[PDB]
Symmetry: C3
């Protein structure tokens, strides 16, 4: 159904750097690292990208993204993250929120090196959007359910010196295409 199972935008603080990477449905697994190969098919390298506003602090952090992470889509649209770098990663995920009994969105999840964790569930997502839309009928919030965000080196949130992800030196925002298609359908039945 989707041409690309996802599209990824990389940011350094509140600036988007480089262009959006679109992962074909033919690449179930995509790696995002600090390397430099621009060929980009099933691997999105952040090391060769320029940013005229880059600071030494951002360059310092980019040094630590190393092997980065692998994003894997299982089935129609279930998503898993595998932390390949030797530095912990920080993920914003509604699925992980629920699985931690944390209030929706009110949590940043630290994924340790070598960790292979599931970060999104399609069906759960579909159920939640229908219920959430239905309750609304009795889109900016609903779309966030189909998006994952990940900071590569600095954690953000309450117990950190950083209030928001846009305050981290290097992060990505992942748009789940199949999830968004379902949301589009839902929105039309409203």
């Amino acid at each position: 159904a989707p041409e690309y199972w996802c599209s990824i935008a990389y940011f350094e603080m509140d600036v988007q750097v480089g262009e959006t990477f679109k992962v074909p449905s033919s690449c179930p697994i995509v790696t995002v690292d600090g390397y430099v190969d621009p060929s980009g098919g099933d691997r999105f390298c952040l090391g060769q990208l320029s940013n005229v506003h880059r600071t030494e602090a951002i360059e310092r952090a980019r040094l630590h993204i190393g092997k980065g992470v692998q994003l894997e889509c299982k089935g129609e649209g279930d998503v898993w993250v595998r932390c390949l770098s030797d530095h912990a990663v920080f993920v914003q995920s509604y699925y992980l929120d629920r699985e931690a009994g944390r209030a929706p969105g009110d949590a940043v999840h630290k994924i340790y090196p070598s960790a292979y964790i599931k970060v999104f569930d399609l069906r759960q997502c579909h159920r939640q959007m229908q219920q959430q839309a239905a309750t609304a009928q009795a889109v900016d919030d609903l779309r966030r359910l189909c998006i994952l965000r990940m900071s590569f080196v600095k954690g953000w949130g309450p117990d950190y010196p950083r209030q928001s992800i846009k305050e981290t030196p290097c992060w990505i925002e992942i748009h789940l295409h199949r999830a968004l298609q379902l949301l589009d359908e839902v929105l039309h039945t409203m």
Copy 2:
């Protein structure tokens, strides 16, 4: 001749949001709405796009783009707009300027809900660019003749609190490819 009959860039105030959408010549009609399907072929959805600088005022306005508009290319490059939302749209068009006896560029045209209006004429455009180039010979101005701009919710101009389109919360700039090809030819005969 053109691969894409047009390319569209969406803005929120003076910031371009999302990437440029390119409409294949195979899609004579393209819809631009406030929905969220990212599949984008003959439909450019603005609802799923993020903007780290977005304000509540911009989110309020995006709420009103709804079904948006349809841009249709008739023949080689004649363009028509159909207002699908239940909110009026505001178009900058040299063709509409001439048809309103308004000074070139000195007008913003309000297109009401359900309205199906012609906003660009290829041949007129071709005639005007030749005459205008010829007079110049006796490119920033000439290219504007091949561009349409449209604000989705707020009108701008003299009788409005907004001086320019870049002051509106959500708008698009449409580049007419065939028109630009003709302009390129003209410029080489100068």
Copy 3:
């Protein structure tokens, strides 16, 4: 090996304008000019691009890019520049630095009208990255070796009123794909 032998980003001061142009390996020669054809395959036109932050000074300079330059890839990845405009061009190239006995990066090279000069050598590049990486083992610097930058009208550097290229009204940054692939390999053997 590479799908695109290079990708080019255009800037006006410190703002990237338009999207990145990707040159297929099928187009050994690509022309970058001040014209307006958006078809862009083996020719990247800067004249039809908009920039809401553009100043009259930038428009004045864009007026002088005219026929611009041709970038040619000879063999696997040797690069030559041909100055087609009647205005001199200003290139940042490590290859040209070495050939001028200038300290790496500490030079801006003026290429005069009609000049057809070689600005990059693949093998030299490969040798330098290996040596440079090896010395480091005893990536932001290494990647610059695979990048060419060119200001179209204003020269920058010590003997000019402009300290950096991001201070020029119109310039491009060219990423050499094959060179970057070699660098990626090198980095993995570290």
